[PDB]
Amino acid sequence: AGTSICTSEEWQGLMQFTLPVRLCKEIELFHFDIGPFENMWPGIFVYMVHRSCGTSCFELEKLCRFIMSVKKNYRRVPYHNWKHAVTVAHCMYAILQNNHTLFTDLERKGLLIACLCHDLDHRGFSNSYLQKFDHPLAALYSTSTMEQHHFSQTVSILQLEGHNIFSTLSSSEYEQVLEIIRKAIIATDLALYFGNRKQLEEMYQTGSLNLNNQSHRDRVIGLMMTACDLCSVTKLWPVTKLTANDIYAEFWAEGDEMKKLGIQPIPMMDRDKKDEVPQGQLGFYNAVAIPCYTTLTQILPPTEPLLKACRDNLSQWEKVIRGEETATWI
Ligand SMILES: Cc1ccnc(N)c1[N+](=O)[O-]
Ligand code: NI
Ligand code: NI
């Protein structure tokens, strides 16, 4: 019920936060893992907004209120949580820093915010589940069900007193940024990714791809969102493997619910089918992750380290399948 709002203590605390100096260098890198720095996550987001967009892009009080309320509207689910949000935002920061002048000031601020917000109020259930069991959300949002909800949650947070970080934009730019954010969040529906990547691959290979063409821009931005959403697969192996544990924890909980409603879940969501996970990851990397980072690297050459890391992780899943895995901690 309702939108959660941070405390005075929470946002005033973030305002006074200072990022440890050693992390300034690390945060610029694609492979940076926020994992070991939980207390710093909101501060890391402020830092990234300030470096990409400028210290005066948003009023500081409103930005800190906005961030801490965003955190409060992520649920305590195993994967689609606050940590995922900040991780996705950091990948976007790294893509933007490496491609800075391709994107307008409006796009950069919109996208970093879009990434922080893109899974807002996720309940640990897939679009598949919501539509199968006719959740009210599936009635309201016929396609891209959770993503339309996440966007709606974003707008609800902006509408809280003192939270509207975009108010100082012209009426035209304000409309433009909300549209950038809407399209970006909707694009995190993996259903849409397959069509988008295919089209972009075609536009690229024929050389019709043109970033001055708004519809092309929207599609490139869409693939950036996919690349950021999936970036757990671009980290160092132990990080990728630990995150995969959280992804599956969520899946198995959904699968358990389906069994109670008389439907056998897909194997991926079946906790009694963990033997199939390594092959399932192989499938996911071959079908989704590798093609994504492949096309993204063609369009944005500086993103190549995402693709190299993804390939290294595919090799690791292959090693698992062959029985070559070494000691793992969880
Ligand atoms: C969405 C998804 C599904 C299966 N395996 C994954 N690694 C994954 N992912 O990366 O988010
Ligand atoms: Ni999502
Ligand atoms: Ni996500």
PDB file of all heavy atoms in Angstrom, residues 80 84 118-119 122 146-147 150 188-189 229, ligand 2:
ATOM      1  N   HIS A  80      15.958  -8.764  -7.463  1.00  0.00           N
ATOM      2  CA  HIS A  80      15.466  -7.482  -8.043  1.00  0.00           C
ATOM      3  C   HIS A  80      15.273  -6.449  -6.939  1.00  0.00           C
ATOM      4  O   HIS A  80      14.162  -6.033  -6.644  1.00  0.00           O
ATOM      5  CB  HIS A  80      14.192  -7.686  -8.851  1.00  0.00           C
ATOM      6  CG  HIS A  80      14.403  -8.482 -10.103  1.00  0.00           C
ATOM      7  ND1 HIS A  80      14.117  -9.826 -10.182  1.00  0.00           N
ATOM      8  CD2 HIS A  80      14.889  -8.128 -11.316  1.00  0.00           C
ATOM      9  CE1 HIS A  80      14.408 -10.266 -11.397  1.00  0.00           C
ATOM     10  NE2 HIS A  80      14.890  -9.259 -12.099  1.00  0.00           N
ATOM     11  N   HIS A  84      20.758  -4.527  -6.937  1.00  0.00           N
ATOM     12  CA  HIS A  84      20.625  -4.659  -8.416  1.00  0.00           C
ATOM     13  C   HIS A  84      20.477  -3.275  -9.077  1.00  0.00           C
ATOM     14  O   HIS A  84      21.160  -2.957 -10.062  1.00  0.00           O
ATOM     15  CB  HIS A  84      19.446  -5.555  -8.772  1.00  0.00           C
ATOM     16  CG  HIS A  84      19.117  -5.586 -10.239  1.00  0.00           C
ATOM     17  ND1 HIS A  84      19.961  -6.153 -11.171  1.00  0.00           N
ATOM     18  CD2 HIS A  84      18.027  -5.162 -10.926  1.00  0.00           C
ATOM     19  CE1 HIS A  84      19.399  -6.075 -12.364  1.00  0.00           C
ATOM     20  NE2 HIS A  84      18.226  -5.479 -12.250  1.00  0.00           N
ATOM     21  N   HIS A 118      14.652   1.292 -12.463  1.00  0.00           N
ATOM     22  CA  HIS A 118      14.028   0.425 -13.425  1.00  0.00           C
ATOM     23  C   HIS A 118      13.339  -0.832 -12.911  1.00  0.00           C
ATOM     24  O   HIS A 118      12.548  -1.427 -13.659  1.00  0.00           O
ATOM     25  CB  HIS A 118      15.064   0.034 -14.528  1.00  0.00           C
ATOM     26  CG  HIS A 118      15.888  -1.154 -14.136  1.00  0.00           C
ATOM     27  ND1 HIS A 118      16.994  -1.064 -13.319  1.00  0.00           N
ATOM     28  CD2 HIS A 118      15.674  -2.473 -14.340  1.00  0.00           C
ATOM     29  CE1 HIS A 118      17.443  -2.279 -13.071  1.00  0.00           C
ATOM     30  NE2 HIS A 118      16.654  -3.146 -13.676  1.00  0.00           N
ATOM     31  N   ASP A 119      13.619  -1.245 -11.655  1.00  0.00           N
ATOM     32  CA  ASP A 119      12.973  -2.421 -11.107  1.00  0.00           C
ATOM     33  C   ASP A 119      12.179  -2.031  -9.865  1.00  0.00           C
ATOM     34  O   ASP A 119      11.852  -2.888  -9.056  1.00  0.00           O
ATOM     35  CB  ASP A 119      13.995  -3.540 -10.803  1.00  0.00           C
ATOM     36  CG  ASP A 119      14.141  -4.522 -11.958  1.00  0.00           C
ATOM     37  OD1 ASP A 119      13.130  -4.674 -12.678  1.00  0.00           O
ATOM     38  OD2 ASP A 119      15.284  -5.106 -12.109  1.00  0.00           O
ATOM     39  N   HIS A 122       9.642  -4.198  -7.457  1.00  0.00           N
ATOM     40  CA  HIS A 122       9.618  -5.583  -7.939  1.00  0.00           C
ATOM     41  C   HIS A 122       9.251  -6.521  -6.799  1.00  0.00           C
ATOM     42  O   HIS A 122       9.757  -6.373  -5.694  1.00  0.00           O
ATOM     43  CB  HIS A 122      10.980  -5.960  -8.528  1.00  0.00           C
ATOM     44  CG  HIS A 122      10.919  -7.097  -9.500  1.00  0.00           C
ATOM     45  ND1 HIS A 122      10.673  -8.393  -9.103  1.00  0.00           N
ATOM     46  CD2 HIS A 122      11.125  -7.143 -10.841  1.00  0.00           C
ATOM     47  CE1 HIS A 122      10.691  -9.187 -10.163  1.00  0.00           C
ATOM     48  NE2 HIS A 122      10.960  -8.454 -11.233  1.00  0.00           N
ATOM     49  N   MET A 146       5.462  -5.691 -15.515  1.00  0.00           N
ATOM     50  CA  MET A 146       6.212  -5.083 -14.424  1.00  0.00           C
ATOM     51  C   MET A 146       6.919  -3.798 -14.807  1.00  0.00           C
ATOM     52  O   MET A 146       7.006  -2.891 -13.997  1.00  0.00           O
ATOM     53  CB  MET A 146       7.212  -6.038 -13.761  1.00  0.00           C
ATOM     54  CG  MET A 146       6.588  -7.204 -13.033  1.00  0.00           C
ATOM     55  SD  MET A 146       5.623  -6.575 -11.625  1.00  0.00           S
ATOM     56  CE  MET A 146       6.835  -5.560 -10.838  1.00  0.00           C
ATOM     57  N   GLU A 147       7.415  -3.707 -16.049  1.00  0.00           N
ATOM     58  CA  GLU A 147       8.123  -2.502 -16.486  1.00  0.00           C
ATOM     59  C   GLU A 147       7.223  -1.263 -16.526  1.00  0.00           C
ATOM     60  O   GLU A 147       7.651  -0.168 -16.155  1.00  0.00           O
ATOM     61  CB  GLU A 147       8.797  -2.757 -17.859  1.00  0.00           C
ATOM     62  CG  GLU A 147       9.812  -3.913 -17.814  1.00  0.00           C
ATOM     63  CD  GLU A 147       9.197  -5.350 -17.755  1.00  0.00           C
ATOM     64  OE1 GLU A 147       8.057  -5.605 -18.190  1.00  0.00           O
ATOM     65  OE2 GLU A 147       9.882  -6.249 -17.239  1.00  0.00           O
ATOM     66  N   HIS A 150       7.056  -0.350 -12.968  1.00  0.00           N
ATOM     67  CA  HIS A 150       8.248   0.321 -12.455  1.00  0.00           C
ATOM     68  C   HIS A 150       8.268   1.777 -12.865  1.00  0.00           C
ATOM     69  O   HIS A 150       8.723   2.620 -12.090  1.00  0.00           O
ATOM     70  CB  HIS A 150       9.533  -0.349 -12.960  1.00  0.00           C
ATOM     71  CG  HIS A 150       9.626  -1.814 -12.649  1.00  0.00           C
ATOM     72  ND1 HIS A 150       9.447  -2.325 -11.378  1.00  0.00           N
ATOM     73  CD2 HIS A 150       9.890  -2.880 -13.446  1.00  0.00           C
ATOM     74  CE1 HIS A 150       9.592  -3.638 -11.407  1.00  0.00           C
ATOM     75  NE2 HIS A 150       9.857  -4.002 -12.654  1.00  0.00           N
ATOM     76  N   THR A 188      13.810  -2.511 -20.676  1.00  0.00           N
ATOM     77  CA  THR A 188      14.315  -3.595 -19.808  1.00  0.00           C
ATOM     78  C   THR A 188      13.414  -4.835 -19.763  1.00  0.00           C
ATOM     79  O   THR A 188      13.761  -5.831 -19.111  1.00  0.00           O
ATOM     80  CB  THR A 188      14.623  -3.147 -18.362  1.00  0.00           C
ATOM     81  OG1 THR A 188      13.384  -2.774 -17.712  1.00  0.00           O
ATOM     82  CG2 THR A 188      15.614  -1.989 -18.365  1.00  0.00           C
ATOM     83  N   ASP A 189      12.282  -4.789 -20.475  1.00  0.00           N
ATOM     84  CA  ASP A 189      11.519  -5.999 -20.740  1.00  0.00           C
ATOM     85  C   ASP A 189      12.309  -6.841 -21.737  1.00  0.00           C
ATOM     86  O   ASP A 189      12.336  -6.501 -22.925  1.00  0.00           O
ATOM     87  CB  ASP A 189      10.162  -5.654 -21.347  1.00  0.00           C
ATOM     88  CG  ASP A 189       9.298  -6.882 -21.580  1.00  0.00           C
ATOM     89  OD1 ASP A 189       9.700  -8.008 -21.250  1.00  0.00           O
ATOM     90  OD2 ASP A 189       8.172  -6.717 -22.052  1.00  0.00           O
ATOM     91  N   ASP A 229      21.263  -3.915 -17.449  1.00  0.00           N
ATOM     92  CA  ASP A 229      20.404  -4.797 -16.620  1.00  0.00           C
ATOM     93  C   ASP A 229      21.087  -6.164 -16.427  1.00  0.00           C
ATOM     94  O   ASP A 229      21.045  -6.755 -15.349  1.00  0.00           O
ATOM     95  CB  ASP A 229      19.066  -4.984 -17.337  1.00  0.00           C
ATOM     96  CG  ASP A 229      17.933  -5.421 -16.417  1.00  0.00           C
ATOM     97  OD1 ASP A 229      18.064  -5.333 -15.160  1.00  0.00           O
ATOM     98  OD2 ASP A 229      16.883  -5.840 -16.968  1.00  0.00           O
TER      99      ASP A 229
HETATM  100 NI    NI B   2      13.067  -5.786 -14.625  1.00  0.00          NI
END
